[PDB]
Design a protein around this nucleic acid. Structure first.
Ligand SMILES: O=c1[nH]c(=O)n([C@H]2C[C@H](O)[C@@H](COP(=O)(O)OP(=O)(O)OP(=O)(O)O)O2)cc1-c1ccc[se]1
Ligand SMILES: *P(=O)(O)OC[C@@H]1CC[C@H](n2ccc(N)nc2=O)O1
Length: 540
DNA sequence: GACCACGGCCA
DNA sequence: AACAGTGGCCGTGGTC
């Protein structure tokens, strides 16, 4: 049905490729093809014909650009129909889904994938006509950001492997101690990693009361919430909790990561999935580097393993109270804008209230616990749950919630303005125009409607925070190449850079001004910046 | 071996 | 466990 003109393909053609696995850094390029005007050009040798291309254009262009960089080839990713459909509707997350929705079939052949990329682009670009606010996000944010992400995935990050190997044995012993002590209290051994077996030990053999049930099957839950309430009911809970922390950090971080070091680059390579969340945030996978531990003392020792190359330093930049500043600009609340206009720290103030210490006596562990509460209360946590997390009576948890939103009376008016427009328009949008469709705002079941409501007014705040970060990544990346610095990781409101040790302080100051002034708001955006040889030393 | 659902937990 | 929201990976249990 399509003409099979031979390689080389024309210019501005749409590419179609097949990988041996989903990870472009680890994938073997199995087939390559291009399409334009109906014609489909199939590469004889994929690695040889990959050099004939001058732009990566089509579905998942970023992934092909990452494998190209893996081969020392500069093949920038261009237009991607996935970015058009993702801006039209964040529910369009995969090539299979967008194919079933807007037309065509996602197959496993490079030629058919090439032809589908051209057909999908004309359709989605036609629908995006008129949606100029979304076209601006496409032209100015999403499309150039893929090229930035391609270099981040290709560069990778250095990992102190011998440090994690020693950390594995160091924690392996501490796990055996707790494991043996939990068997002593239970009177018999069992599999502590099996929630079903722990359920019988805690709730049938012991007289411990079951606090709640699981969702799908209705079993007696052994989650950290149930156990945290049973710390005084039995000493076995105290050691089961210490056991969960270690095995989580060992089986997910300390042990898996050193085995993912790439052979050719000697670095760890993640994937930054650009069309994966409903709010416009990025997501990381294979391995996920956006959930490296940082809270517990042992978790912070895992960030020490993320190091710069010899003669380099890591530059970390983190937005301060970012979504609270976003809410101040969206709500227009005079008292909240006044807070960031006077340099006040909401997270430090909340910790000062929990621990009965002044703002000066608050430490980072206290301030991190207050962030969990400040954003929980903001996005609709119940007064009953808040009372249990803070161990305060239900009456005090109500007053804290009312005082929270009465300190900024316009934020609740803004939540209603967003909800009201949500049910009228059928979608909420960020400050830049990125939409999320939430259709259950008029559901008749109170639980389903209220769940849709909490998702509804969260997306503008979190989505605008995501957009300001993407805009900075698009503006900051070219200024780094002219300084010999690299862009490595993005953690939602945080950028991790890598610069030579002599230019590190110059890169830290430049990135600070770019991020702070990426888009001026009614409040100033303040960025905390630190330099170190490792990730933990730079976040300080 | 490959794949999945579930509870559970990290940011 | 809950009227916080956004993600992704783990081991267990069970199938094909
Ligand atoms: O529980 C959390 N729910 C949540 O929605 N978010 C959002 C909102 C925040 O704006 C942004 C960056 O978070 P984060 O950079 O950590 O804090 P931020 O608000 O910028 O204050 P600062 O400490 O950076 O100055 O993620 C974060 C949460 C947590 C992070 C850490 C522990 Se719970
Ligand atoms: P981590 O270094 O403490 O957090 C880094 C990023 C910022 C927001 C995101 N996050 C963390 C924790 C929770 N509960 N929810 C989030 O969205 O991780």
């Amino acid at each position: 049905a399509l003409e099979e003109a031979p390689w080389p393909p024309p210019e501005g053609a749409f590419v179609g490729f097949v990988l041996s696995r989903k990870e472009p850094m680890w994938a073997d390029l199995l087939a390559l093809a291009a399409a334009r005007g109906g014609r489909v050009h199939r590469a004889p040798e994929p690695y040889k014909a990959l050099r004939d291309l001058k732009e990566a254009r089509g579905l998942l262009a970023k992934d092909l650009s990452v494998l190209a960089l893996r081969e020392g080839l500069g093949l920038p990713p261009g237009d991607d129909p996935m970015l058009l459909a993702y801006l039209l509707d964040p529910s369009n997350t995969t090539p299979e889904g967008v194919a079933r929705r807007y037309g065509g079939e996602w197959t496993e052949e490079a030629g058919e994938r090439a032809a589908l990329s051209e057909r999908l682009f004309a359709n989605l670009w036609g629908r995006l006509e008129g949606e100029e606010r979304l076209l601006w996000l496409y032209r100015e944010v999403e499309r150039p950001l893929s090229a930035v992400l391609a270099h981040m995935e290709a560069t990778g990050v250095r990992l102190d492997v011998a440090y994690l190997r020693a950390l594995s044995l160091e924690v392996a012993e501490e796990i055996a101690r707790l494991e043996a002590e939990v068997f002593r209290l239970a009177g018999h051994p069992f599999n502590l990693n099996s929630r079903d077996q722990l359920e019988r030990v805690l709730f049938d053999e012991l007289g411990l009361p079951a606090i709640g049930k699981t969702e799908k099957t209705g079993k007696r839950s052994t989650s950290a919430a149930v156990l945290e309430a049973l710390r005084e009911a039995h000493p076995i809970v105290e050691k089961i909790l210490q056991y969960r922390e270690l095995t989580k950090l060992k089986s997910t971080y300390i042990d898996p990561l050193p085995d993912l070091i790439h052979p050719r680059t000697g670095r760890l390579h993640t994937r930054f999935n650009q069309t994966a969340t409903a709010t416009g945030r990025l997501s990381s996978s294979d391995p996920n580097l956006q959930n490296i531990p940082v809270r517990t003392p042992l978790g912070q020792r895992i960030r020490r393993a993320f190091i710069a190359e010899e003669g380099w330093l890591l530059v970390a930049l983190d937005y301060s109270q970012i979504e609270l500043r976003v809410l101040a600009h969206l709500s227009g609340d005079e008292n909240l804008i006044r807070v960031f206009q006077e340099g006040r720290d909401i997270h430090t103030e909340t910790a000062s209230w929990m621990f009965g210490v002044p703002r000066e006596a608050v430490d980072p562990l206290m301030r991190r616990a207050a962030k969990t509460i400040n954003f929980g209360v903001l996005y609709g946590m119940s007064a009953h749950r808040l009372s249990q997390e803070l161990a305060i009576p239900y009456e005090e948890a109500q007053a804290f919630i009312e005082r929270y939103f009465q300190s900024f009376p316009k934020v609740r008016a803004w939540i209603e303005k967003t909800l009201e427009e949500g049910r009228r328009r059928g979608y909420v949008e960020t400050l830049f125009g990125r939409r999320r469709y939430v259709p259950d705002l008029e559901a008749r079941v109170k639980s389903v409607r209220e769940a849709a409501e909490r998702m509804a007014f969260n997306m503008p705040v979190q989505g605008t925070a995501a957009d300001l970060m993407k805009l900075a990544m698009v503006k900051l990346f070219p200024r780094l190449e002219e300084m010999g610095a690299r862009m490595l990781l993005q953690v939602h409101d945080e950028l991790v850079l890598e610069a030579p040790k002599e230019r590190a302080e110059a890169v830290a100051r430049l990135a600070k001004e770019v991020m702070e002034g990426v888009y001026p708001l009614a409040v100033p955006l303040e960025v905390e910046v630190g330099i170190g040889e490792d990730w933990l030393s730079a976040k300080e």
